[PDB]
Amino acid sequence: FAKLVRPPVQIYGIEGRYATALYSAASKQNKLEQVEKELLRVGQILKEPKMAASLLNPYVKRSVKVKSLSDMTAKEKFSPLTSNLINLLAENGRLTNTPAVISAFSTMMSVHRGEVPCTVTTASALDEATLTELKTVLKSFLSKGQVLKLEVKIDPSIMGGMIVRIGEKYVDMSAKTKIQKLSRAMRE
Amino acid sequence: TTGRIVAVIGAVVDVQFDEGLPPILNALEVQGRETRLVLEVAQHLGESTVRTIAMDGTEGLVRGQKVLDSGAPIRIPVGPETLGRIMNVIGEPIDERGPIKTKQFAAIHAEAPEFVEMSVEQEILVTGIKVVDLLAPYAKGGKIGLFGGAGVGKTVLIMELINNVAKAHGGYSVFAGVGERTREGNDLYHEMIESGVINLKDATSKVALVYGQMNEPPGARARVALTGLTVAEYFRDQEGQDVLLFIDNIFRFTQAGSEVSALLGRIPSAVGYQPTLATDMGTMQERITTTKKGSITSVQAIYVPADDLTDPAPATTFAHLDATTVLSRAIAELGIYPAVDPLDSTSRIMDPNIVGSEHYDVARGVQKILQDYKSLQDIIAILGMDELSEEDKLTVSRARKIQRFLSQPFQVAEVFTGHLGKLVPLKETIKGFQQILAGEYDHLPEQAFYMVGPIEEAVAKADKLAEEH
Amino acid sequence: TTGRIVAVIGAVVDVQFDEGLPPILNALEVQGRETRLVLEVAQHLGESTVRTIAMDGTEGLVRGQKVLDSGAPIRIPVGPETLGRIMNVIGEPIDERGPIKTKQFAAIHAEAPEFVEMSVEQEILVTGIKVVDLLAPYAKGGKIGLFGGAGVGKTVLIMELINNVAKAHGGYSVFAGVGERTREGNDLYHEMIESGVINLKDATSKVALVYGQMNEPPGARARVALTGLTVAEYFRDQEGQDVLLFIDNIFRFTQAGSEVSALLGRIPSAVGYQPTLATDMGTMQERITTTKKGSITSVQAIYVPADDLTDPAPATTFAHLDATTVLSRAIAELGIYPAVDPLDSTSRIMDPNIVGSEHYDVARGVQKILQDYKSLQDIIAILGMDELSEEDKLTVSRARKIQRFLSQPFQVAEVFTGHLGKLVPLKETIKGFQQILAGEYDHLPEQAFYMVGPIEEAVAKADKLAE
Amino acid sequence: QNMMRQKEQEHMINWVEKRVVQSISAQQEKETIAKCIADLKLLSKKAQ
Amino acid sequence: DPVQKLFVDKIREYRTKRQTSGGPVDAGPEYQQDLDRELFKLKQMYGKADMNTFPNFTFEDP
Amino acid sequence: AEVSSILEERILGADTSVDLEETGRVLSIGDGIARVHGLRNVQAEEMVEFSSGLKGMSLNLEPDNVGVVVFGNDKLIKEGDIVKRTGAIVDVPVGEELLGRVVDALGNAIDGKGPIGSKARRRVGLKAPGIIPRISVREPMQTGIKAVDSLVPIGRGQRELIIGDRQTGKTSIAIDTIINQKRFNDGTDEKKKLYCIYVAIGQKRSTVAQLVKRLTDADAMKYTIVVSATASDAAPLQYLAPYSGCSMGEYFRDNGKHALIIYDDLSKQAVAYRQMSLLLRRPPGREAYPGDVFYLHSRLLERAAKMNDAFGGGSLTALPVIETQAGDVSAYIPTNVISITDGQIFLETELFYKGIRPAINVGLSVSRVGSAAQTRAMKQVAGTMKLELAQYREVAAFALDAATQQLLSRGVRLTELLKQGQYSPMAIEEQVAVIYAGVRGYLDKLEPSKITKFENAFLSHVISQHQALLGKIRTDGKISEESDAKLKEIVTNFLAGF
Ligand SMILES: Nc1ncnc2c1ncn2[C@@H]1O[C@H](COP(=O)(O)OP(=O)(O)OP(=O)(O)O)[C@@H](O)[C@H]1O
Ligand SMILES: Nc1ncnc2c1ncn2[C@@H]1O[C@H](COP(=O)(O)OP(=O)(O)O)[C@@H](O)[C@H]1O
Ligand SMILES: Nc1ncnc2c1ncn2[C@@H]1O[C@H](COP(=O)(O)OP(=O)(O)O)[C@@H](O)[C@H]1O
Ligand SMILES: [Mg+2]
Ligand SMILES: [Mg+2]
Ligand SMILES: [Mg+2]
């Protein structure tokens, strides 16, 4: 078979297989950025209430769906890769999980351009200076060229401190866990 | 080629290859293990993944561990240097004596001999056991079965055969322990060292041992039989000589095959066995054969789950054997040892034109008298012995004498009975049973015949019983 | 929080919470129903969905309907104000007498007592039943179990035990009827009202009733045993008293599980039973223990499917009991009643260091003679009782006399047969069986023992037979 | 005496934790957060 | 070690509990009710003898 | 006062070190099984931990998620939780520090009494000793039951099986074996001391409490460990308890000491494993048990070895307890464990109710070691007793001539001799004395219903007047000619005087 080039992050499931096929197809020939832009475009194109209502009805024949999608793709001037992907999803009847593919490829493209999603959780918000030093130290955690994608949720359930996720790495300096640890130490 | 573990479920490992896939049955080596873990490819799942069964514990495997592809099936060391050693499924030694230094490595998977290689000659192999020699005589180059449940004498009988045939056998010998107690493996190692078949000093060892006991994961039990079979095959071909091949038990091969089938995606069949039971057993039992280039005498112990001879595993195994000796628990309860069932045992050579008309007629007379005894036992349960026709009592007396006279003391069962082992030449067994049937002993009591060699020993035991009466 | 129904298959409902997910066992309220529908959470499916078991009929649930999290498991009213009342799974009174006014609620999903809480005391509980008292003596504070197929005497026996034990009981009592006839619960309610054990117009009621009878869905039968357990636990731990917890029928607790397990997408195990049969049974049955804070003397009626004691449910229950009492249909067909099988029934306190040496010796002699008779039965059935030695004929006669003597007339069966109920103190039982065993009564007819109190009544019956 | 010992021990534990969960609701923020980023620095430099 | 603010906070609430333990603080009626419950249970399990000094036996000869 | 002080001593030392640890998010939790997403480097059968301090084991490594089994209750794990890998295969504490302690399947003290001072840990899933370390079973494991020490003897390093129905007397045999070792453990020589481990699987906590108090009464917790994975303990704990106990015993045998482990039952470990496997979605097998249900036990009972003198010389006996259904020994798990173990001890209800207690069915009970692993005195006497009972069983179904009438008499005398009580194991020399008296035709004069009397009385005599003879038999370990002549005169005198 054709030795497909594997994506960086492995997505699994039906969306995973379709997205890995698309990523392998795009990586050779080199069209990942353009195909991602086209995928984002079709993200809205199909979302149109008329098109969505006409594509979620399984009683319109697959022939009509494929013809309508060919007309839409021609009317939008896509790469042959995206047009063939939409045709393939339509033939197999996998339109109801099309967004999961566009989502998957996004997750698959973000890692391609080097990104490590991050999460920070605190009892209360932060002052921008402290957020800046967090940015600096977390970028210290990463490697070379690996941009960071910070997210700062606020969880009052914890009683203070901080909780930080960098990919699968996890550091929990929250008051709640220290309280739990010390309390359990007492009871033993 | 280099691949990458992508799943670990029990003993089944899914390995993904970015380059070219390895063919089915190839051996792969996991990189990053302190010991040696070898996976064997069993399926191609598409998308470059291959499913495999691990020949060792899959503990501490990490999704992503690199894997090397050896390019050939599991290749074991073969030759005269394996004699006196012990081995795994993958051929590395487990006797703590250093590397096996051979020049030839043989793959454990091979095609069975073709039809234009079969030997069609049969000649009795005298084992020295009365019941075996009389009713189900073995044959040189033939495959022997030893069916029977648990605790009936399979291991003792096979040890007795190694004591007899193997000790005084010029050719070599191989013993494959497949999924049996490790205690027994150690006991056999030491018993051979004592006897002298395994010589730890010189290079005069006559036995090669392969072990994959019941602590091993199913992958290793399902293949240690093939490893022992490969050693035996080499000694059959290149050495061009007679070989013995003892296997204990060959039901653990089937069972180990059944412990992974459900995880390989196969629907179960029959009583929860893999769908490929008969094919998997045939592709193995068809390499244990006496071609025209050599000659393997194969003795197999076959566990029968719950004494059930109609279970799919023993039922299928029946068709691959020339001789069978169905050890029975109902006879072992009576104290008749070996508990070989005289009516449920058979042999191919048991024909008047191969053994002789005297031997054949004696055997058939014994079987007929025992069957008549069984028919009478139903009546005796209602009447009583006191109400039988004075001829029927004669049948019962002869039948009980013959039932006891088939018992024999082994040289390996000294510990249990405390008696001494006897080897009974074939002519003496035929004479003894012909006389017992002819009536030349209808005055000696039954117990005189219990656990004795030739008939004269029964006469002497009766004399002693009478003197100390 | 607020989620929306997405699936409604049988009694299993899937609810999607976009905001905070509710933990497991946490209860939910379906908003928009005529009555209260409570959904107990059971799994998290990912994608912010939770599978739940509905504690009431799910007909009328619309996809997209709104479900409101309640924040705590099913909390029921507990206290001394739940005596004389009738409750259901979710603690709602069903006696039409007004809300159960308590100041303390208990979640029905508490954990079992730890190991440092168990009590090792082993006393003997006298029930006034000859077969139960002699061969399988019940113990105070222990778990008891009556095994038997359909229509062998489980409920009659448990009502006799209610009568006897819980009339001579100064402590509280709790009857949890899980998966049994509704008219049986009504009869129990009215028998207690008549018998003074319940005061509708006072505060001297000593029995709390919980009921999830057979007419209710599989989600209510599963979680009603837990309600009874909680009501009993309060009276044990808090009030620090000695409780009687009768359950009937506990099989319906596991059965109900196997009804929802199928819908929860779990692979069935032995005979279509849920894969988690033994774990659920254990977590239920280890909360009925007698700890150091109090005592629970729980009697459980267990139903044996198709009279099969090899079934996974009774076979698993056997390991959770001190005393058993395998009621048998074969014996019940002979007319013996209670149909207790003297050889299947066992007990932990059948120890010469607890019951004595005369009690122990008599019990073992009775069992030995009955086992000898059982051994002979196969030959007796074909060859006839004439091909027997004289010792064997004596054994057969003694064994039949003993079999009949173990039968007793209960008071709860006064209506069935018109006989008079009998209690047989332990000493009288032991003495009567001693006499039968020694052979003192070999001149009587075996039908002189059929259904009598103490043995002297058997002698009087024989004398009347002579006339 | 041992019963009272353990009962008082559990009461001590419960009261102490009940008090600490309320004390921690104060605002030591800047100090604890600065220490947290200091620990982050230590972990980062100590990782590679 | 002088840094784990939760560590020293727990130690401080400890010291306060130490000083304030003139009588079981925040006891509530559950304190007394329990104490009584298990005291009575222990008394019942052990015995009713003269729980102060050695009760005398005054046996009887064979 | 000092109560709070010792409470503070616990805070004074904490776990400041926070590390950068790998994690995963719980995609789905339900029925005791979590499907974590992440944990890319988590090993197979590794120990992971949850956000609430609750442990678990990563059993399934699928490409998209890791199937984790929770060692405890499951209501506290939410979706989107956090699972931290501890980077260590499941392991348990081991050492003499555990003796006398009741612990759960994971080695946590369960009886209060403080913590375990264990200074070492051992992996539960360790491979059995090879073929070379072992050595044939030589010493005898003294069980105290006459019918087991005489007719189905057990050596050290053997793997007996106690198989029967419910309530026939299996745990009773286990407890008698545990209690008997007190005489050896109290003595001086360390070559006889046997440390006992009792794994209680699926038994309700009340039963284990009764058992522990019974051992305490007999002063037998000095050397006993109790690993309880009772019924209310999640299936992943009842699955793992046998392996934890086996590691605690492997520690002993690996250090020249001797250990005894008693799994009770294995038929409930099988059920817990089946529940785990069915909730991980692995396809079922026969009777719904997974395919790997034989392996489960074979890998566990193969660790009961007898190390040779180069590897310390230590041993580890095992007495798995199986439970059949109405005597259907032919079931699935019973047959598996029967073909795994060495000997067997068949207890039968028909014998339990017929008065024979322990119900040991001497006809079917077997022991492969047999001859070996039996003291010379017992070997001398029990052989003749075995022959006499074997002959008796043939002609027993009925009940004339002098020879067979006396044969039945002797058989019945021996049968009533073999009976016994509970928690009163007898020293081997006392068993030899009783069996000798019975088998040397002395009791043939007495009635059978009275035999028990004699038995008891006889011991209470010999145990006081003739301590010297019993000491001789024990020390020399055989019935010498002078010892035989003494025994003869003692029995002849006692019989008439009674
Ligand atoms: N040697 C004996 N003498 C007298 N009674 C005995 C003897 N052995 C066992 N028993 C009785 O048998 C009963 C059950 O004993 P035990 O618990 O040992 O069996 P079990 O099969 O383990 O029970 P379960 O399997 O239900 O736990 C006990 O109540 C005890 O009184
Ligand atoms: N020839 C024999 N004489 C006496 N007893 C025997 C003999 N063979 C086997 N046995 C009995 O069987 C047991 C060993 O059985 P074994 O053959 O090892 O089991 P299996 O056949 O199931 O592998 C011994 O304990 C012994 O009592
Ligand atoms: N002690 C008894 N005396 C007479 N009949 C009885 C007795 N116990 C049960 N029965 C019979 O059994 C029936 C009651 O069965 P029951 O035990 O209520 O069924 P279940 O076993 O389903 O609870 C009655 O109709 C009655 O004929
Ligand atoms: Mg064997
Ligand atoms: Mg009923
Ligand atoms: Mg038990």
mmCIF file of all heavy atoms in Angstrom, chain C residues 151 153-156 158 180-181 183-184 248-249 301, ligand 5:
data_model
loop_
_atom_site.group_PDB
_atom_site.id
_atom_site.type_symbol
_atom_site.label_atom_id
_atom_site.label_comp_id
_atom_site.label_asym_id
_atom_site.label_seq_id
_atom_site.Cartn_x
_atom_site.Cartn_y
_atom_site.Cartn_z
ATOM 1 N N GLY C 151 -43.816 -21.148 46.531
ATOM 2 C CA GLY C 151 -44.862 -21.854 47.243
ATOM 3 C C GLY C 151 -44.392 -23.022 48.081
ATOM 4 O O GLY C 151 -45.017 -24.086 48.051
ATOM 5 N N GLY C 153 -43.062 -22.202 51.527
ATOM 6 C CA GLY C 153 -43.336 -21.792 52.888
ATOM 7 C C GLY C 153 -42.471 -20.659 53.390
ATOM 8 O O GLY C 153 -42.342 -20.471 54.600
ATOM 9 N N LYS C 154 -41.873 -19.891 52.481
ATOM 10 C CA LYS C 154 -40.995 -18.805 52.900
ATOM 11 C C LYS C 154 -41.763 -17.738 53.662
ATOM 12 O O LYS C 154 -41.355 -17.323 54.748
ATOM 13 C CB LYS C 154 -40.318 -18.182 51.687
ATOM 14 C CG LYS C 154 -39.204 -18.994 51.105
ATOM 15 C CD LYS C 154 -38.356 -18.146 50.197
ATOM 16 C CE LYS C 154 -39.170 -17.511 49.098
ATOM 17 N NZ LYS C 154 -39.943 -18.513 48.340
ATOM 18 N N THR C 155 -42.868 -17.263 53.095
ATOM 19 C CA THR C 155 -43.598 -16.171 53.727
ATOM 20 C C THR C 155 -44.336 -16.642 54.966
ATOM 21 O O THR C 155 -44.416 -15.913 55.954
ATOM 22 C CB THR C 155 -44.574 -15.541 52.743
ATOM 23 O OG1 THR C 155 -43.854 -14.723 51.817
ATOM 24 C CG2 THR C 155 -45.585 -14.689 53.474
ATOM 25 N N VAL C 156 -44.888 -17.851 54.943
ATOM 26 C CA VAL C 156 -45.526 -18.363 56.148
ATOM 27 C C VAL C 156 -44.503 -18.483 57.266
ATOM 28 O O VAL C 156 -44.765 -18.108 58.414
ATOM 29 C CB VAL C 156 -46.216 -19.704 55.861
ATOM 30 C CG1 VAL C 156 -46.465 -20.451 57.147
ATOM 31 C CG2 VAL C 156 -47.514 -19.475 55.128
ATOM 32 N N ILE C 158 -41.686 -16.779 57.565
ATOM 33 C CA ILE C 158 -41.209 -15.473 57.999
ATOM 34 C C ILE C 158 -42.275 -14.768 58.820
ATOM 35 O O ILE C 158 -41.955 -14.001 59.727
ATOM 36 C CB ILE C 158 -40.762 -14.620 56.798
ATOM 37 C CG1 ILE C 158 -39.684 -13.633 57.221
ATOM 38 C CG2 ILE C 158 -41.914 -13.828 56.236
ATOM 39 C CD1 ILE C 158 -38.957 -13.021 56.065
ATOM 40 N N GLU C 180 -42.509 -8.427 46.426
ATOM 41 C CA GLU C 180 -43.478 -9.432 46.844
ATOM 42 C C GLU C 180 -44.883 -8.899 46.595
ATOM 43 O O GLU C 180 -45.068 -7.751 46.194
ATOM 44 C CB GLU C 180 -43.279 -9.816 48.314
ATOM 45 C CG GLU C 180 -43.569 -8.700 49.304
ATOM 46 C CD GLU C 180 -43.805 -9.220 50.705
ATOM 47 O OE1 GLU C 180 -43.772 -10.453 50.896
ATOM 48 O OE2 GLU C 180 -44.021 -8.396 51.616
ATOM 49 N N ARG C 181 -45.885 -9.740 46.849
ATOM 50 C CA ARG C 181 -47.261 -9.368 46.546
ATOM 51 C C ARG C 181 -47.670 -8.133 47.332
ATOM 52 O O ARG C 181 -47.303 -7.964 48.495
ATOM 53 C CB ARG C 181 -48.219 -10.505 46.882
ATOM 54 C CG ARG C 181 -47.891 -11.842 46.278
ATOM 55 C CD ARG C 181 -48.815 -12.886 46.861
ATOM 56 N NE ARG C 181 -48.660 -14.200 46.258
ATOM 57 C CZ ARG C 181 -47.601 -14.980 46.426
ATOM 58 N NH1 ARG C 181 -46.590 -14.578 47.179
ATOM 59 N NH2 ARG C 181 -47.552 -16.164 45.844
ATOM 60 N N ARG C 183 -50.858 -7.434 48.102
ATOM 61 C CA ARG C 183 -51.864 -7.834 49.073
ATOM 62 C C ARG C 183 -51.225 -8.477 50.295
ATOM 63 O O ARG C 183 -51.783 -8.405 51.391
ATOM 64 C CB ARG C 183 -52.874 -8.777 48.429
ATOM 65 C CG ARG C 183 -52.303 -10.094 47.983
ATOM 66 C CD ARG C 183 -52.629 -11.194 48.967
ATOM 67 N NE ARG C 183 -51.979 -12.447 48.609
ATOM 68 C CZ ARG C 183 -51.824 -13.474 49.437
ATOM 69 N NH1 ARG C 183 -52.273 -13.403 50.682
ATOM 70 N NH2 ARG C 183 -51.218 -14.574 49.021
ATOM 71 N N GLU C 184 -50.052 -9.088 50.139
ATOM 72 C CA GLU C 184 -49.327 -9.582 51.303
ATOM 73 C C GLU C 184 -48.875 -8.435 52.192
ATOM 74 O O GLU C 184 -48.950 -8.526 53.422
ATOM 75 C CB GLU C 184 -48.129 -10.414 50.863
ATOM 76 C CG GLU C 184 -48.438 -11.877 50.670
ATOM 77 C CD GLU C 184 -47.207 -12.680 50.333
ATOM 78 O OE1 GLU C 184 -46.206 -12.074 49.906
ATOM 79 O OE2 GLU C 184 -47.239 -13.916 50.497
ATOM 80 N N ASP C 248 -37.995 -9.603 52.358
ATOM 81 C CA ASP C 248 -38.847 -10.566 51.681
ATOM 82 C C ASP C 248 -39.367 -9.927 50.404
ATOM 83 O O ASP C 248 -40.284 -9.106 50.482
ATOM 84 C CB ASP C 248 -40.004 -10.979 52.596
ATOM 85 C CG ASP C 248 -40.770 -12.188 52.081
ATOM 86 O OD1 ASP C 248 -40.157 -13.091 51.483
ATOM 87 O OD2 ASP C 248 -41.999 -12.240 52.291
ATOM 88 N N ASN C 249 -38.830 -10.250 49.225
ATOM 89 C CA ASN C 249 -37.867 -11.315 48.953
ATOM 90 C C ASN C 249 -36.578 -10.712 48.431
ATOM 91 O O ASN C 249 -36.612 -9.910 47.513
ATOM 92 C CB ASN C 249 -38.456 -12.269 47.922
ATOM 93 C CG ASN C 249 -37.705 -13.554 47.823
ATOM 94 O OD1 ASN C 249 -37.204 -13.906 46.765
ATOM 95 N ND2 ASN C 249 -37.642 -14.284 48.919
ATOM 96 N N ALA C 301 -35.754 -13.718 53.296
ATOM 97 C CA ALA C 301 -36.311 -14.763 52.458
ATOM 98 C C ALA C 301 -35.685 -14.666 51.077
ATOM 99 O O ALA C 301 -35.703 -13.603 50.456
ATOM 100 C CB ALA C 301 -37.825 -14.623 52.370
HETATM 101 MG MG MG G 5 -44.081 -15.151 49.697
#
